[PDB]
């Protein structure tokens, strides 16, 4: 028998807010966080908008001198991590520091910093590269810096599974705890790929919406006029904790993490199978892991990226796993409002699923004006829907056909 894993702290930066409550208020209000990007010249680019973190002050977390050593994706991950630990009320001691670890990841990592160092290298040569370039850019430095700042000596690692990172990081941190390798883990993801190589890279593959004239309507999952995903920045972190450890210190418990599934499509480098067969195996794996019947699922936070192929494949997977119950559950994409935070998408979407359980409200899919052929489920179009939610599922699918599913249940 495994130990049980509960959520006792959450932290976030998103295009809707600098913490969880501000973000969640934007989610329930149906607000968009998408705007034209201000921090660079995008004249030559086919996409000029995305979800930026507005008003972030790294000096609430680090000295200006510490912060100069670290890429934005690392600053964002540290901010979500410090928020989640504070939110949990956990006290790190000599008695428990070896039982507390970190799994914070990223899809694309230190693109901005690499881009800024390339400028210096071609302009002036290698003498102008920062001494902190390597440690300040590598994906495991959110886990490393957090562990150094807080004295965490438990398992210390980072996942990178592109758009699935946040979901895999959380699920494998839950495994660490379930099988007794740690009592507490800080887990999630962070991303800041709005540089030329990000917008340019995804733009070259024709993956991005180009609705430059109306950025707030660009992200429209399952709508007949969708034209690709919206690139967004930010971070999510959750304090995962063994149940008996949480109860002993009187921790506030948001929800229980009951299931985790993984699968590979083994199909294509960027496209899903049109029946979403890998996403179907993943969800069934997560439900078998939790000991749940499909009929017990009330709410799905979809991957729902606003791509032609992805959105439909996910409807097919849900119809196949849930049969008739596909028309009773509610499913929405919060990416209609946040855009796609890539490696952080699963971390902020885990937090939205947990708060959907806490508040007993399904977040809306905004911009769902004309649902496409076969998109006939309850996708919570336009407006938040209060409803009963005992079980919430969160899905992430990524480049390489790598899939993750998390199942959260109410804890009483």
Ligand X SMILES: CC(C)OC(=O)c1cc[nH]n1
Under rule CB under 8 A, residue 288 binds a second copy: no
**175-194: contacts with a second copy (CB under 8 A):** 175, 179, 181
Candidate list 48, 69, 217, 387; residue touching a second copy; CB under 8 A: 69
Under rule CB under 8 A, residue 167 binds a second copy: no
- Give the CA distances from residue 116 to residues 24, 55, 253, in Å, rounded to whole numbers and listed in that order: 33, 22, 42
Candidate list 125, 248, 388, 412; residue touching a second copy; CB under 8 A: 125
How many whole angstroms separate alpha carbon 407 and alpha carbon 394?
7
Q: Are 336 and 368 in contact (CB under 8 A)?
A: yes
How many whole angstroms separate alpha carbon 290 and alpha carbon 283?
11
Q: Are 13 and 5 in contact (CB under 8 A)?
A: no
399 phi and psi, to 5 degrees? -45, 140
Task: List, in sequence order, every residue forming a beta bridge with 411; answer none if it has no partner.
Answer: none
How many whole angstroms separate alpha carbon 309 and alpha carbon 293?
28
Residue nearest to ligand X (CB): 310
Residues 342-381 as x/- pattern, contact with a second copy by CB under 8 A? ----------------------------------------
Under rule CB under 6 A, residue 109 binds ligand X: no
**191-210: contacts with a second copy (CB under 8 A):** 196-197, 199-207
Residue with smaller CB distance to a second copy, 202 or 408: 202
Q: Which residues contact 113 (CB under 8 A, 6 or more apart)?
A: 71, 133, 136, 137
Rg (the chain; Cα; Å): 20
Q: Are 256 and 240 in contact (CB under 8 A)?
A: no
317 binds, among ligand X, a second copy, none (CB under 5 to 8 A by kind): ligand X
How many whole angstroms separate alpha carbon 26 and alpha carbon 336?
12
- Pick the stretch among 53-61, 139-147, 195-203, 395-403 that binds ligand X (CB under 6 A): 395-403
Please list every residue in the chain followed by a chain break, i.e. its C lies more than 2.5 Å from the next written N. Answer: none
CB atoms within 10 A of CB 129: 14
4 binds, among a second copy, ligand X, none (CB under 5 to 8 A by kind): none
Under rule CB under 6 A, residue 300 binds ligand X: no
- Pick the stretch among 10-18, 51-59, 351-359, 400-408 that binds a second copy (CB under 8 A): 400-408
How many whole angstroms separate alpha carbon 201 and alpha carbon 58?
27
Task: List, in sequence order, every residue forming a beta bridge with 190; answer none if it has no partner.
Answer: 235
> b/e for 69-85, b at 16 or more Cβ within 10 A?
bbbbbbbbbbbbbbbbb
Residue with smaller CB distance to ligand X, 245 or 303: 303
- Pick the stretch among 19-27, 309-317, 347-355, 366-374 that binds ligand X (CB under 6 A): 309-317
**161-180: contacts with ligand X (CB under 6 A):** 163
253 binds, among ligand X, a second copy, none (CB under 5 to 8 A by kind): none
Under rule CB under 6 A, residue 276 binds ligand X: yes
156 binds, among ligand X, a second copy, none (CB under 5 to 8 A by kind): a second copy
**24-53: contacts with a second copy (CB under 8 A):** 44-45
Q: List residues near ligand X by CB under 6 A.
A: 163, 272, 276, 278-279, 303, 310, 313-314, 317, 397-398, 401
């Amino acid at each position: 028998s495994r130990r049980r894993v509960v959520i006792t702290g959450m932290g976030m930066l998103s295009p809707l807010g600098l913490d969880v409550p501000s973000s969640w208020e934007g989610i329930l209000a149906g607000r968009s966080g998408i705007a034209p990007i201000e921090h660079m010249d995008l004249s030559a680019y086919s996409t000029r908008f995305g979800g930026s973190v507005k008003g972030f002050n790294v000096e609430e977390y680090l000295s200006a001198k510490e912060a100069r050593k670290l890429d934005l994706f690392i600053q964002y991950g540290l901010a979500a991590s410090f928020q989640a630990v504070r939110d949990s009320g956990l006290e790190v001691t000599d008695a428990n520091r070896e039982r507390i670890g970190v799994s914070m990841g990223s899809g694309i990592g230190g693109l901005t910093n690499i881009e800024n160092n390339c400028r210096s290298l071609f302009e002036q040569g290698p003498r102008r590269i920062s001494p902190f370039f390597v440690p300040g850019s590598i994906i495991n430095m959110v886990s490393g810096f957090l562990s150094i700042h807080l004295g965490l000596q438990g398992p210390n690692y980072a996942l990178t599974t592109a758009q699935t990172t946040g979901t895999h990081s959380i699920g494998m941190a839950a495994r660490n705890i379930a099988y007794g390798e740690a009592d507490v883990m800080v887990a999630g993801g962070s991303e800041m790929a709005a540089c030329g190589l990000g917008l340019g890279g995804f733009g070259a593959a024709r993956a991005l919406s180009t609705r430059n004239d109306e950025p707030t309507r660009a992200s429209r999952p399952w709508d007949r006029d969708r034209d690709g995903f919206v690139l967004s920045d930010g971070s999510g972190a959750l304090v995962l904790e063994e149940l008996e450890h949480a109860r002993a210190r009187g921790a506030r418990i948001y929800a229980e993490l009951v299931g985790f599934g993984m699968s590979g499509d083994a199909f294509h480098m960027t496209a899903p199978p049109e029946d979403g067969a890998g996403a179907a195996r993943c969800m069934k794996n997560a439900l078998r892991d939790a000991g749940l019947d499909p009929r017990q699922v009330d709410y799905i936070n979809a991957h729902g990226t606003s791509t032609p192929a992805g959105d439909i494949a996910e409807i097919a997977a849900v119809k196949s796993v849930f049969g008739e119950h596909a028309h009773a559950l509610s499913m929405s994409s919060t990416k209609s409002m946040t855009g796609h935070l890539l490696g952080a998408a699963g971390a902020v979407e885990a937090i939205f699923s947990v708060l959907a359980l806490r508040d007993q409200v399904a977040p809306p899919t905004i911009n769902l004006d004309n649902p496409d052929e076969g998109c006939d489920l309850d996708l919570v179009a336009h407006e938040a829907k209060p409803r009963k939610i005992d079980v919430a599922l969160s899905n992430s699918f990524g480049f390489g056909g790598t899939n993750g599913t998390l199942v959260f249940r109410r804890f009483a």
